[PDB]
Structure 1
Amino acid sequence: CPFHEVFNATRFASVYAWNRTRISNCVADYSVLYNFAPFFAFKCYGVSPTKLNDLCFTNVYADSFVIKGNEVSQIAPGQTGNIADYNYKLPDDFTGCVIAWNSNKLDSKHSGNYDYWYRSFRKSKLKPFERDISTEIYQAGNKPCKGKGPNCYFPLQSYGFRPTYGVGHQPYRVVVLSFELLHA
Structure 2
Amino acid sequence: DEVRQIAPGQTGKIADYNYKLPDDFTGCVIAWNSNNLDSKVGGNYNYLYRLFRKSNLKPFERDISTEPLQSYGFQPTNG
TM-score category (smaller protein) = over 0.9
1:118 Cα deviation after fit:
0.6
Q: Which has the higher helix share?
A: 1
> TM-score w.r.t. structure 2 length?
0.92
Q: RMSD in angstroms over aligned alpha carbons?
A: 0.9
- For 1:112 and 1:118, locate their aligned partners in 2 and report how far apart those are by CA, in whole Å: 16
The answer to whether the 8 A contact 1:107-1:161 is kept is no
Secondary structure in structure 1 of the residue aligned to 2:32: strand
What is the aligned counterpart of 2:70 among 136, 157, 175?
A: 157
| Greater Rg over alpha carbons, structure | 1
- The aligned runs of 1:40-79 (5 Å cut-off) are 70-79=1-10
Unaligned runs of 5+ in 2: none
Q: Partner residue of 2:45?
A: 114
Q: Which amino acid aligns with 2:75?
A: R
Q: Partner residue of 1:90?
A: 21
1:134 matched to 2:65? The reply is yes
> TM-score w.r.t. structure 1 length?
0.42
Q: Which amino acid aligns with 1:82?
A: K
Higher relative contact order (CA 8 A, sep 6+): 2
- Dislocated runs of 4+, deviation >3 Å: none
Q: What is the total number of aligned residue pairs between the two structures?
A: 79
Identity of aligned residues (%): 85
